[PDB]
Design a protein around this motif. Sequence first.
Motif, PDB file in Angstrom:
ATOM      1  N   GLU D 221      -3.873   3.086   7.440  1.00  0.00           N
ATOM      2  CA  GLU D 221      -3.720   2.849   6.015  1.00  0.00           C
ATOM      3  C   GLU D 221      -3.144   1.465   5.764  1.00  0.00           C
ATOM      4  N   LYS D 224      -6.071  -0.894   5.976  1.00  0.00           N
ATOM      5  CA  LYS D 224      -7.333  -0.432   5.402  1.00  0.00           C
ATOM      6  C   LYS D 224      -7.984  -1.479   4.484  1.00  0.00           C
ATOM      7  N   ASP D 333      -1.723  -2.601   0.491  1.00  0.00           N
ATOM      8  CA  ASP D 333      -1.776  -1.601   1.552  1.00  0.00           C
ATOM      9  C   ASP D 333      -0.804  -1.970   2.660  1.00  0.00           C
TER      10      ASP D 333
HETATM   11 CA   LIG Z   1      -4.321   3.764   1.188  1.00  0.00          CA
END
Ligand SMILES: [Ca+2]
Lengths: 510, 510, 166, 388, 388
Positions: D221, D224, D333
């Motif tokens: 994540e 990402k 992010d």
């Molecule tokens: Ca995310």
Amino acid sequence: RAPTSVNAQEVHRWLQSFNWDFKNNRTKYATKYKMANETKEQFKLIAKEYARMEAVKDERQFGSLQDALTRLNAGVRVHPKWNETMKVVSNFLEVGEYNAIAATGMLWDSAQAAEQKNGYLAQVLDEIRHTHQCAYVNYYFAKNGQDPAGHNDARRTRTIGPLWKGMKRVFSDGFISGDAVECSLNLQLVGEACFTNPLIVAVTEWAAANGDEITPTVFLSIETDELRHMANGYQTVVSIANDPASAKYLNTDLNNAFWTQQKYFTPVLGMLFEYGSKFKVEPWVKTWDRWVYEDWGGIWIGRLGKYGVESPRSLKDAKQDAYWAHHDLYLLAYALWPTGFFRLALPDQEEMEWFEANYPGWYDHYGKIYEEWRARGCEDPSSGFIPLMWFIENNHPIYIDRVSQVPFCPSLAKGASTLRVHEYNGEMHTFSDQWGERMWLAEPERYECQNIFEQYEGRELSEVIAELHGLRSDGKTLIAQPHVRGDKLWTLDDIKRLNCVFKNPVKAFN
Amino acid sequence: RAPTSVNAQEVHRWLQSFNWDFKNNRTKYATKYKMANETKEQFKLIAKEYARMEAVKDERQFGSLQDALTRLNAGVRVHPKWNETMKVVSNFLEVGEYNAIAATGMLWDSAQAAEQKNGYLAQVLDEIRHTHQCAYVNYYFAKNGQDPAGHNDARRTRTIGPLWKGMKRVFSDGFISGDAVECSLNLQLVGEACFTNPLIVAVTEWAAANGDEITPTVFLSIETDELRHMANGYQTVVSIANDPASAKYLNTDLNNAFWTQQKYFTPVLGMLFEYGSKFKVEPWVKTWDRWVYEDWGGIWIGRLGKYGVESPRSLKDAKQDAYWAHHDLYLLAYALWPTGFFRLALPDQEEMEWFEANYPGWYDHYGKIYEEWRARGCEDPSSGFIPLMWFIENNHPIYIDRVSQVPFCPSLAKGASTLRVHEYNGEMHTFSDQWGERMWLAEPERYECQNIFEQYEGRELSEVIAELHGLRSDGKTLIAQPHVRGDKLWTLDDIKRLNCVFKNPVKAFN
Amino acid sequence: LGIHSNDTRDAWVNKIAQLNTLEKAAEMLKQFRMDHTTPFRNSYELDNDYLWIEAKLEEKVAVLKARAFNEVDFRHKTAFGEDAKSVLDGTVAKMNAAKDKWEAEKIHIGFRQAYKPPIMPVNYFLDGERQLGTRLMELRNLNYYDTPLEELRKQRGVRVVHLQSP
Amino acid sequence: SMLGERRRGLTDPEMAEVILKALPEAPLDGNNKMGYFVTPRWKRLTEYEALTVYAQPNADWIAGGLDWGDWTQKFHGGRPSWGNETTELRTVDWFKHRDPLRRWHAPYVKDKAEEWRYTDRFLQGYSADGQIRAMNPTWRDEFINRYWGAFLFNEYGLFNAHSQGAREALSDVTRVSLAFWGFDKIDIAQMIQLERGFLAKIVPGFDESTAVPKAEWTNGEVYKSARLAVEGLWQEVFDWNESAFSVHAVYDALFGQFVRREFFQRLAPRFGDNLTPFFINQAQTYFQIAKQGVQDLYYNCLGDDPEFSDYNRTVMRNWTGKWLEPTIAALRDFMGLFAKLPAGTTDKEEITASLYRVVDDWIEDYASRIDFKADRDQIVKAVLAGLK
Amino acid sequence: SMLGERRRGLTDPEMAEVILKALPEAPLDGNNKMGYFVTPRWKRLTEYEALTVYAQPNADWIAGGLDWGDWTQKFHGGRPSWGNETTELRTVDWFKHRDPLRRWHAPYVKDKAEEWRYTDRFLQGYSADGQIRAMNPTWRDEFINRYWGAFLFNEYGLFNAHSQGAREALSDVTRVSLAFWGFDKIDIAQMIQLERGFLAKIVPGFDESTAVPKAEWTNGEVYKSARLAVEGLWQEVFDWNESAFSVHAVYDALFGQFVRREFFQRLAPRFGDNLTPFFINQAQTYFQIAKQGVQDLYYNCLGDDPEFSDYNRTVMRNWTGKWLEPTIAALRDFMGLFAKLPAGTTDKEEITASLYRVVDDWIEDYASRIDFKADRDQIVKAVLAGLK
Ligand SMILES: [Ca+2]
Ligand SMILES: [Ca+2]
Ligand SMILES: [Ca+2]
Ligand SMILES: [Ca+2]
Ligand SMILES: [Mn+2]
Ligand SMILES: [Mn+2]
Ligand SMILES: [Mn+2]
Ligand SMILES: [Mn+2]
């Protein structure tokens, strides 16, 4: 706490993993072939190690050039004919190098396996090195040589003459224009494996024989790099040997690639070697017959028949042209000497013997013509004569092959004098062989290169030269010359007085 | 937020203060002179910048050597006489460089000003580079030359002959043994300034004339460094010009320094140049006069006049005993050729003409003798004759100067012929001039070097050679030779059959 | 029976091998220096081997001294148990009190003959070399050329054997 | 043969004499300066310019070209070997660009080689000095191996974004710079791997496999949005200038500078890690070196082009807006990585300050050059929303 | 002219012809390996050994010499150019030593030059990247400028301690190593000054004058005992081996390693200082490079000498005891610098750990090689005694 480091192979082992997958992770270039993303490269290098091995080579090279060679006056103690020849050899190869940069960048884009991309990357950087190396030979001969003109501005003066056009075809456009696999073959599978590598070596030989120690110093260094590109040459034929398409497109592209290269280099390299040197090394004919046969079209291409690779169907015809093509060509190059950026010389007596001994019938054809041109005063400025005039007088038109750009005189040639003239949508096109003709017929839009006669039509010779800066620093003397002596150099006015006016030879056809 | 950095000049602005005064912040070496701690150095360098400028020089040098020069076979296409001469020149200069290392380290210890210490430090590293450079010339000629023996083991084979002893005196012991200021003069103010430097250049000239491009490549590089030690040469005469002692000691150590140096190089160098070469550059007589007059003894020394420095009081004597010194020495060197580690050749026809033309009277003396020796077969191993015999037969004793170690033969010399023999506490001592005699009489303990006749007394020639490894790889053929041809080389046996047993010539006075 | 390997050297090697005590070995070293080193050596019979022999003798003395002496003594005492600093300061004193260059050279030379390591510790010895040497040169290089050869020969006390000068 | 069989013209008496006999008394032209016709960027012409300018055989119909006529062989369909059609940007001369560092091949590999050899010496001293002992285990096994390791794929992706430019660049000076910009990026990616491979040798149990860091990059994540931007810049941009400009003057100037300098460079030391900062020193040196070239091409040459200045600024301004959003997302992010750090390592205030530094530098170094109206507060604010 | 007036024997037809005619058909000896008579330390002889071993003209009376006879000219008094009398140590051959890195002049300046050029590139990137911003002011103006700056005089003093060895070393292999050991130390001292001069350029008000750091060194309390040891090692030791051994195998292995690695290298990062660690990376590389040579000479060669192994160990053991004391004092006085630090920077536990690291490394690398019985606890305790 024992001293330890990490080398390139230890890092390269994980390079194949660097690439990851995503929807648009694909080539931006059109290509009939699909490159397997599992392909590996022969050399396990990383930017750092690549840089180091290349730097070590530079040290030796530049060390020799700037130090001992300069002290020995190596830039000067070279035969005049060779000093001139290197203006063409080095700069023309420079563009082949330069275009190989863009071409391998395209191959790099095509490859999907990180390792195959890495192999090409090394080459992209090598071809830049090579560009700069060829540039350095000219740079060096201009700084320390017997005649800087041509060496000092070939990048702009090369545009005046016709020989340059064909160079951009085999080592420029043929390298980057078209299917990446087609360009790959024009550059690696044929350009280098068949001509460049054996050529680079040959140049160093012809150079050494004529007092040139500068070129061997640099070119021998270029050869070491090209060794990797060769091993990387099969890598392209391996990543597609499986794809069904390869089994039906490979041979065709390989055939054209071969004809393209051969059509130009066969006659030009040999021309520069035999007519551009004082001391000979070996007849082009047996030098060629070796490269294309005992080194390529057999002991090299036969090691790939297991991938569906066959033999160049135009290999037979091509052979019938490495004997006379270069001779057919010097006739034209000399005849049009005022259009070059180098000085040319008529074959002397000792040379004519060599020519006749190594190519029977050379004298009754070329020899007698050269003798006549000298009788006409072609070397002396006051003669008011340029061999071109002779072609007009004796009705021997000169055409330019719309595809290869190779100048040819079908009425006098001893090579492939098969002229073909076509008209299409308001334009005339002239070909010299059945191969280049099929190329144009199938791919019209790929070959629209306008020739010197079309561009120069109706222009007075002197004006083209002056416009394209074909002069020495005295702003009056021509860079090009019909002889390599130190005096009696032709001037712009000597050419203007001739009042030569180009005309498009194809316009006589109704 | 602009890109900035710091260079050597900026950091060296604070190096002078690096040293701090305290209890025993003083030199560990004995010296009559006091060096001012305010002295500055001419070049503002730091280790990093020193290393860089030196590395750039290495690149060019080794690049030329390993690449172009190797390709041109430069290690081979040298005249045989010169290949031999370089074994002596390079290795003998190697020890001069090597001892210069220790000597400047001593000067570094002597200097109290951080900047003067830094100047010497740069030199310490330079002399190390020169040691390694001279070593490389021998290393290179051994690897690629026409005769490796001598080049490959001079460091041990140099110990057999008498010429080597005098070398350790001027460029070894004379460099490190004695008052640091005395050693400073032997190395920089006289050695380097009067001989070493102009010599380095000359060597490159004589080398080029004889086909040697290896030595110029290295030695020209050594010169660049030396151009810096020169400027650092006055720095030693400036840090003492004030001290009262200097006005009472300088001139004496300098006079002895001058004599010491010229006592050896005046004869050896001229000899090596004129007799170790085929092609000539300039008669040594004119070279020496320029170096030791219009240059050193004149221009260079005259500028130091404002520091008290006076021209050597032995300058008139040196020029007197010089004209024939080198010629006189070669007769001796050749006569004792088996004790060398290099091959010697006798003057050919053109050479004798050259020698006579340049040194009138040369033929009637030296010329005739060489023809006599040659006709008697001194070059033939089956003649059983070596010129040493001719000296014994004609009662021409060969002595070694207890001080300079230079060999001299009073009864045959065309140059100086003075000889002085003394006996002190059971040992005999032979001297060749009034200056060396003085040095010994006053400093008996400084001069106890045993000569070859003393160490080899009673020993048979072939045995001394064998014990000291004066042979080529076959374990039989001598390294040394009385000619430079490839056939009919002398072997140990050929020598043993002569039955030459050494005698201490001094004992003839018992 | 050559330059680096001969009967004389072999002889001294065996001789040296039988020196099991420091006092003996040290005394033999000093005696060796008086007999074979410097222009004042009692004899020149070992001229071609003394330098090498002496070194081999020093070797034994150093090894024995290291096993016999405690750390402090090895650093500050001579092989003869004398206080190194004393000897140094004493000899330097005499040197400065030297009337002329002749008495001076006798002081310096003898100093080397009697205390050259492994007798005296190197640190003190070289400290001595530094001071003694400075004084000696000062005296010797003063009016170095005034005295003519004819007289200098007599001052040195040499026996002129032969002279030549055209 | 000691001598050999090949007779060389320079040393062979017979041949050399023939050569010497044919030589002119003096050179046939006193202009011994190759490239004399090139317009110097500085006082005197440089070796860099002589060896490079005009190597590309462009005809006059491609701004600045000196040749004439069409290409000899083109692509199926008619596409030119090189053409104006490969980029939106327009100029009066594509040969105006100059790498401020004047790097041609020789100087380039020389500098990198010195770096390579020093790096080797460094690692050998580092390990022998046992400095690894004082390095935090958590930071080593989690942040360096996983998060720093994953970043290599970011740099690798940026490297690959240069592929098309190597093929399409309209001049030698630009092609060469482009090539060196991309090569430096692949170098950094490899250096990141070199460090992991180094740790694996001096730290038992340390896995040099890229599996973990790769997994983090492909499915994590933290990176990402970064990966999404990278994938686009590389494979969704067919304009060689948009790619180069957007990569160096937008994405890497923001995201890259933050990750490299404001995260790892700034925090590694706090965990007794001086190993990583050694390599970041390189990446930062490389970034600053490329910046000078990037500025010269897009601002000095294109952005200030005498005839297309206004036009080009509009385009780059357009590109900046196009890629600024994905970059902000990448940063956003990335903010999530801070939650992973051990408590007390750093606070929201420092994070915000470091963000403002990157943005402020970006605005002064890039955005302001094309008059792109950037709002530091709004940009920073958008990113901070990523702080978990 | 174009051809010049000087005729060269390699290219002049006439001269070259004469030369070629006088050449032998083949070389007069097939042994083309210079130094073939040298005993290789490794598999095959190295360029390093060929170019170095036996360059020193020692006669057999100086262990390992190949010549014979006395020196031609000696010192007033009789002192030999080189002699056994200049060192307590004894060996069977002074030419046994080998620098593990095989450094002769060329390789040495090549490596340092690469470092120099990289350093330049680094500083230019550092300043352009504006990394200076995140560096603690107090640490910069007080600890770097004053205490780190003062250390330069420590390294400078160690450099100067090599002077006598450059003159007295009894062999080429040793002389060359000695020279490089000392040269590296002056380099470090100059690098310390380079950093101060660098800060002065990117930090307004920063004084590059050495006045302050010098004053700290000459009259401070932190380095008082350090300076006292330095002054002795340099000017109170006349034995070239005692100096080299005591400097590298005792004082710098303890005090130096602690100051460089356990103080500045360890704490600089904590204050956002990555500048200083860049230079310490060099000093540490240099220290580790010299250590290999130091070990080979004093342990492999002298300490394990076939005939003087026991003797030499006694001497070095003696030397270790002699200098271990002043070194401890130097460390003790240095402990005072911790008090000048801002609260919380580091605690007594870390200090103790870093001390144990230096000592443990010292015991493993040096002390145990000569069987010197060292007590880690007692040593650490003593240095810890005068702790701030
Ligand atoms: Ca995310
Ligand atoms: Ca019609
Ligand atoms: Ca806070
Ligand atoms: Ca705002
Ligand atoms: Mn290439
Ligand atoms: Mn290639
Ligand atoms: Mn020198
Ligand atoms: Mn010098």
